[PDB]
Paper text:
In particular, l-lysine decarboxylase (LDC) is an important enzyme for the biosynthesis of cadaverine, which is a crucial platform chemical with many industrial applications. In this report, we determined the crystal structures of LDC from Selenomonas ruminantium (SrLDC) in different crystallization conditions and observed that high flexibility of the PLP binding site seems to be one of the factors that lead to the low affinity for PLP in SrLDC. The monomeric form of SrLDC consists of two distinct domains, a PLP-binding barrel domain, and a sheet domain. The SrLDC homodimer is formed by a head-to-tail contact between the barrel domain of one monomer and the sheet domain of the other monomer.
To reveal the molecular mechanism of SrLDC, we determined its crystal structure at 2.0 Å resolution. The asymmetric unit contains one SrLDC molecule, and the dimeric structure of the protein could be easily generated by applying crystallographic P43212 symmetry. When we superimpose the structure of the apo-form of SrLDC in P43212 space group with that of SrLDC complexed with PLP/cadaverine, the overall shape of the two structures is almost the same, with an R.M.S.D. value of 0.72 Å. However, remarkable structural differences are observed at the active site. Interestingly, in the structure of the apo-form of SrLDC, the connecting loop between β-7 and α-8 (Phe178-Thr187) moved away from the PLP binding site by a distance of 5.0 Å, compared with the structure of SrLDC complexed with PLP/cadaverine. Because the conformational change disrupts these hydrogen bonds between the loop and the phosphate moiety of PLP, it might severely impair binding of the cofactor to the protein. Also interestingly, the conformational change of the PS-loop subsequently causes a more dramatic conformational change in the loop connecting β-8 and α-9 (Phe220-Asp231). The loop, located near the PLP binding site in the structure of SrLDC complexed with PLP/cadaverine, moved away from the PLP binding site by a distance of 12.2 Å in the structure of the apo-form. In contrast, in the apo-form of SrLDC, the loop is stabilized by the N-terminal region instead: the main-chains of Met1 and Leu228 form a hydrogen bond with each other, and the main-chains of Pro223 and Ala225 form hydrogen bonds with both the side- and the main-chains of Asn3.
Residue numbers in the entry:
A (entry chain A), B (entry chain A): 1 to 140, 150 to 225, 228 to 380
The structure:
């Protein structure tokens, strides 16, 4: 199960009929990522963190697979709502909610909410009386209550008429270590037992996301999941457990196709200007501190090269001292691992359009494969 | 001529009928900025760098004042086109242009282009034969040709059938010093004289933008402009001169109104969660490295406080150790100097909506003033 990657040959045919920049998403790779987690982490229901990639066809696919969704705003709920997904398939997992989100949640039957602060309680009580709440704990600044505050928060939520349902945590570092998940599970187990004595019965546990990215998927990743799963089955036999994969689901299912629109050859280091930049899909360099494999298809010897985005900004520099062949205006390059926290942070700065996401499975290139 | 600033009283009335976050733009302040530059820098025609703020009503206002526009993409041309602005009022001042931009330029009668590289010539020659070109010089990495390459570039453009029209430079640091503008003017004067001997007659000079921001406007800023203007009248009596103000035009004409939607009071330092963040108008913290005056309207004693945005991201932190009164959910705060490179870099990340820009002059609060 390889990471999705267009061939030089497919790049060229796509770009003849689709103007660059564009992204190409493989629904089959998304499905493979989903089934892999199902196979090796069966105990955890999936709350897909759609903030990572909200492409409508990806969301429809996941929903038909049985996925639930972690939503952060009215906007995300609205996107899902248009695809026929109900609030019963959502959790409003933004710890601090606004009026619009709360109204959308009530409109679309979202009953599950997360919170970490006493200030969030009355607002949820008024907006969705009797709703199910999970307290977010910090097992380690912006989010999560102190472990030893968790059950008083759930109790206060119960006092205000909400249903104290469970606990969630986030411990994913994108490391292969299971230690941090397993550790969190032991803390959660203790709080679940203490809660029973306080007149609460907790039923759901959410272990968050931030899984390691799949190999350009592999056995070590499968083994980590099996190990998490074994601890879940041991510790929480009768509890509904959930995970919130985001990057994991789509990061490796999408690529970016971008054209060289300018060169500068006067420096020792040649510069190539691409038609997508740091204000577009590469915004993930700014916000996500991420790096994306760049593939140039040139034959010849290569020299350290700079790639810049199309903006009038000086900051729109993508790669420096990158070994690359001599490229010319009109050449297409290919950037992989472009599925997560890239397109979602794109802007209309300078009036540039949002690069569209094209579905591979709907293209002649797919049948040929 | 003060910087635009809503009163506590206007904030409250606005927010009762407009849900936060929203921006409020003062057309009168924009006009005042424009007329100020006209008054003190009469020689320079204005190419408004709309990338800084493309609010339709601001653009309509400027166009009716006689402003021209510096456009960077098809998208920007399209925005202007919908407001009845013609390409005769535009310069396509992105040194590396794409197919869509070039097609929009031909559709909307844009005849003026800037360039800095030999690779850009043939593309412009094919797209807009005979168009007027200005070479961008570096007087100081992404943009600008070496000074001593400038006239060979203009000559090569002439060879390909384009019209060698002039030169532009960018030297604005947002310092009060005129030295850098004046210096550039002497370089330009030398190239204009050399060009005459090479069979070119240059007619237009563009001195770029990056003016100092107007005082929370002032006499020192007026004096700088008068001094630039005096050197323009001396050096370039018969040349059409232009400037590309961006930040200067609107930065001080717009404010952001945002609500406290959550608090965290358990730390020594209280945290306030606002309904606009780093993925929205405060994206200028990321891309523009800028700082925005924050005004809280509270009565009481104040303590170092953190303000965070509404996102599920950890990075959405706006102000730390900021002296602030005790604020509560539902309180509105006010951020000034929010007119430039803020809204333009906002995203739909997490599904959040783009904060809309409301025109002050269309509000009951304006008449009351
Ligand atoms: Mg993940
Ligand atoms: Mg159990
Ligand atoms: Mg300026
Ligand atoms: Mg002259």
């Amino acid at each position: 199960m390889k990471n999705f990657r267009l061939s030089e040959k497919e790049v060229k045919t796509l770009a003849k009929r689709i103007p660059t920049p564009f992204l190409v998403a493989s629904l089959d790779k998304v499905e493979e990522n989903y089934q892999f987690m199902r196979r090796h982490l069966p105990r955890a229901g999936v709350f897909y963190a759609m903030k990572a990639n909200p492409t409508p066809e990806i969301l429809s696919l996941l929903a038909g697979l049985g996925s639930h969704f972690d939503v952060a705003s009215a906007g995300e709920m609205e996107i899902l709502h248009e695809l026929g997904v109900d609030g019963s398939q959502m959790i409003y997992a933004n710890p601090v909610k606004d009026a619009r989100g709360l109204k959308a949640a009530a409109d679309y039957n979202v009953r599950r909410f997360t919170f970490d602060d006493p200030s969030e309680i009355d607002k949820m009580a008024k907006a969705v009386p009797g709703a199910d709440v999970l307290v977010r704990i910090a097992v380690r600044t912006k989010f999560g209550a102190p472990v030893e505050e968790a059950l008083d928060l759930l109790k206060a939520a119960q006092d205000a008429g909400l249903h104290a349902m469970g606990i969630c945590f986030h411990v994913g570092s994108q490391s292969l270590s299971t230690a941090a998940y397993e550790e969190a599970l032991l803390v959660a187990r203790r709080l679940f037992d203490e809660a029973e004595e306080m007149g609460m019965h907790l039923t759901d546990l959410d272990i968050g996301g931030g899984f390691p990215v799949p190999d350009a998927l592999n056995v070590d990743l499968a083994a980590m999941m099996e190990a998490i799963n074994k601890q879940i089955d041991r510790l929480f036999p009768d509890t509904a457990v959930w995970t919130e994969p985001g990057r994991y689901m789509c990061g490796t299912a999408v690529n970016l196709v971008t054209s060289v629109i300018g060169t500068k050859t006067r420096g020792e280091q040649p510069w190539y200007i691409l038609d997508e930049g740091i204000y577009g899909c590469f915004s993930g360099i700014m916000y996500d501190h991420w790096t994306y494999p760049l593939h140039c298809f040139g034959k010849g010897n290569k020299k350290p090269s700079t790639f810049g985005g199309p903006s009038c900004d000086g900051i729109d520099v993508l790669y420096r001292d990158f070994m690359a062949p001599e490229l010319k205006i009109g050449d297409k390059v290919l950037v992989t691992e472009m599925g997560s926290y890239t397109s979602v942070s794109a802007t209309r700065f300078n009036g540039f359009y949002l690069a569209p996401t094209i579905i591979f499975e709907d293209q002649p290139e797919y049948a040929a494969r």
